[PDB]
Design a protein around this ligand. Structure first.
Ligand SMILES: [Cl-]
Ligand SMILES: [Cl-]
Ligand SMILES: [Cl-]
Ligand SMILES: [Cl-]
Ligand SMILES: [Cl-]
Ligand SMILES: [K+]
Ligand SMILES: [K+]
Ligand SMILES: [K+]
Ligand SMILES: [K+]
Ligand SMILES: [Zn+2]
Ligand SMILES: [Zn+2]
Ligand SMILES: [Zn+2]
Ligand SMILES: [Zn+2]
Lengths: 75, 81
DNA sequence: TGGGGTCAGAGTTCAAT
DNA sequence: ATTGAACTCTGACCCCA
């Protein structure tokens, strides 16, 4: 699948268990690494609006099956 | 089979010896790559970074010194086919 | 075996915002 | 600080004698 399951943008392969784009991959990574927590509870997450709501973007990452445990230690 | 051994370097599972030492597939691949390209690394800390399964990639310098300390032989790495 | 190889999916960088 | 396009590294899983 070459469509990001989260935002619908063109996809880069599987990442953390989900067909996703580099943006959603990088966003999920940073969210898990820094243990970040956001505040919005169901905004639209597509390509153009993906950055508009960090809370909803991260919730959808999880809802599409992204695995926190797949984010490794910073090297 | 993997029942018999663990990696002398990081403690992950091992199916046997590589370059002279019971090691996992990761430390095997890591040691090979380091030698093949003659890579030099640097440690940001005190040259005693903990090397286990979770932390092994966090300092390549320390991972490499431990490969040597445990007995891995650079000369066992062959030329790239 | 214990040498070899591959490449998906982890990693990172850094210009642009 | 944050994003994401475009890179490098890793290691599970193969191939052989
Ligand atoms: Cl080194
Ligand atoms: Cl370091
Ligand atoms: Cl560990
Ligand atoms: Cl990173
Ligand atoms: Cl490297
Ligand atoms: K492969
Ligand atoms: K690749
Ligand atoms: K860059
Ligand atoms: K890997
Ligand atoms: Zn996406
Ligand atoms: Zn929202
Ligand atoms: Zn190891
Ligand atoms: Zn170190």
């Amino acid at each position: 699948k070459h469509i990001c399951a989260i935002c619908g943008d063109r996809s880069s392969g599987k990442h953390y268990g989900v067909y996703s784009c580099e943006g959603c991959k990088g966003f999920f990574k940073r969210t898990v690494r820094k243990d970040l927590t956001y505040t919005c509870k169901d905004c639209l997450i597509d390509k153009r609006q993906r950055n508009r709501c960090q809370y909803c973007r991260y919730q959808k990452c999880l809802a599409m099956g992204m695995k926190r445990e797949a984010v490794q230690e910073e090297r």
